[PDB]
Amino acid sequence: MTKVFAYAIRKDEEPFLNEWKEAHKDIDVDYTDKLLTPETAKLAKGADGVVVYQQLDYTADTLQALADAGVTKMSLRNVGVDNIDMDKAKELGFQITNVPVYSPNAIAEHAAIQAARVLRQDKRMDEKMAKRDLRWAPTIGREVRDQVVGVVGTGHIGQVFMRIMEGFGAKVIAYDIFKNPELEKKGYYVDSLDDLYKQADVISLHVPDVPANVHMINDKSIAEMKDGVVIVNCSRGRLVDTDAVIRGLDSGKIFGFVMDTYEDEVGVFNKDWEGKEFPDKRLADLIDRPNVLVTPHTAFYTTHAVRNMVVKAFNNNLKLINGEKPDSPVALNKNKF
Amino acid sequence: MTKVFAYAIRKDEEPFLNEWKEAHKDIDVDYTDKLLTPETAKLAKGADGVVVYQQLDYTADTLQALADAGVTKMSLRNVGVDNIDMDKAKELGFQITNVPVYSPNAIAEHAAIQAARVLRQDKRMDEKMAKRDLRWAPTIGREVRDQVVGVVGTGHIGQVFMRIMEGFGAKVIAYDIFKNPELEKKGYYVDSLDDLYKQADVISLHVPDVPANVHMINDKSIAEMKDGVVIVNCSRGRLVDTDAVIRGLDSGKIFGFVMDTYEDEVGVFNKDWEGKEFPDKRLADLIDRPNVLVTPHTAFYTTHAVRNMVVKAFNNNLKLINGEKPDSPVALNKNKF
């Protein structure tokens, strides 16, 4: 007998929780559907720690709303932490953990395919089909195996991204602040961005949303690019100046674009605006461009990650519930960029 | 000087004719829009050679019609020679050159992308955005990296598709008449096909439309098949049993199917049916299935292919005009079948 209560368990999470309960024989495990609400906090009744994925706020309030229920043991299924009352959280001694890495693959994967679909002209081709225009001319596609893919950033994610395109048999060029002694041995690294910006056919960003990096793709970076470049930003939105790429698209400079992350994303993304008055037009003019692919921050959303998501969580909590050293305690002091 | 006259030149070919002429400085080159017919055959007047692609037969007469303008050196820009009058050709002793391979990469590339796509459920997402549902759950993607991919057929193309998938990091299984001694050593082969149809998640057909293979995927092949399988045919169509597949898609045994080839395709594909009555109803039901990906025999339509088509074509022909041993002499093998 042990109790962990889960908050915000999606259907897609259901089965992972099973395998982990399926195996974790001795613990008592129960979830529910409503996000952890000051009001819901209460169901967490006499269960040791709580596993809950949420972008909605765990106000200083839902903390006691949950505190009093009998738990100081709470761990997120997600990467995030800035949505909790961290100050009242300690005022309270509240123990949280984070699950910081679910498959870097799904993101690396997700950009390759979006990238590759824009080079092929797959959406123009798919539009003709829907309309029942079954001929292939002149919607010709460019081959992956024939471009020069430049990667901006060389961490877990981006390396994958590297090997994938390598597999297509393309020429990968790379960029980073920290020239990973290893990759640079094979010559991947260029001296500077202004170099990769004019010999890269495809550009995939894989670098944190830094004060420095904020709007690296804009009227100036772009005018240095080749003609008919392809731009991919499956990382942090602010790296790009939307009105800028828009412009590049407008003249024929940028050949296509891939956006699974937008700057004015928050609030707009992930909300069903169907049947509503569509709230943000350029995003809406972008979504429909035939040589653009928008996606709502889906780069991460995959069977393998989610499994990570859930699980790296039931564990970390089991370690909390039980009193043992967990993985990435909630303080994750300067681990993050 | 010299003169080469070309026929049936697509706009997309246009652009490569020049990088060629742009090279071959001492030769005059000139082309036509419409195909060659006794009617036209005059047009290549004085042109030492004629380059040309078409499906209309180079009927019995079309030849002299050509002959009289003064030319007998003609080289096709595409693979097939079963639409040429071999005997007259020979009674005429005309000299011809086909162009046999136009980027095999193009086809293994297009198949690998389409699969990844279905694997990830992109269509369903994109259908979502269009209606404007900017939320992700439950359109969870499966990672190519996590799958077992079975390559049926191991030549130029299947080989290339093999490499890419390992770029993704999937477990690749193959199967083949002639177990290439090299891959076989690395233990990729499986002894039989029923081996394949049961450990394999994605299956990619890359083998010939042989009286033997003519319906390998039918209601029996499938049932061996794994739940959540993903079938991918980008080669000959007769290999799949469309009704088999829909039943499997309908039941749910099939996760996704991807088609660039269709058996009841001659006549429908390559036709603009927009605003006319659509000729084939499963074909369409399929075109629109949330999880099918139909494309009209387009796996080869790439900048690289169409480039060799021309280039390889003009080349070999110049070896004709010049009088050299060129690539791909089509020998009058009476039986065009």
Ligand SMILES: NC(=O)C1=CN([C@@H]2O[C@H](COP(=O)(O)OP(=O)(O)OC[C@H]3O[C@@H](n4cnc5c(N)ncnc54)[C@H](O)[C@@H]3O)[C@@H](O)[C@H]2O)C=C(NC(=O)C(=O)O)C1
């Ligand atoms: N979809 C399109 O746009 C077009 C597709 N194609 C098709 O592409 C495939 C690819 O061919 P490839 O892999 O090069 O074939 P092979 O070298 O012949 O095969 C490699 C090995 O296959 C073995 N093999 C032969 N027969 C069998 C059987 N029955 N079972 C197992 N293994 C077998 C062989 O021994 C080799 O070791 C191709 O098949 C083709 O149809 C072509 C394009 N033009 C078309 O539109 C078209 O003609 O349909 C376009």
Ligand SMILES: NC(=O)C1=CN([C@@H]2O[C@H](COP(=O)(O)OP(=O)(O)OC[C@H]3O[C@H](n4cnc5c(N)ncnc54)[C@H](O)[C@@H]3O)[C@@H](O)[C@H]2O)C=CC1
């Ligand atoms: N779109 C989505 O769904 C999500 C996107 N992301 C994004 O995915 C990317 C991949 O992540 P990681 O590999 O963990 O990142 P990372 O920061 O480790 O990327 C690789 C390298 O970039 C660094 N870096 C920081 N600032 C830089 C600068 N100005 N120039 C060059 N290099 C710089 C590092 O020092 C590091 O080794 C992130 O950068 C992030 O913004 C992360 C989660 C979800």
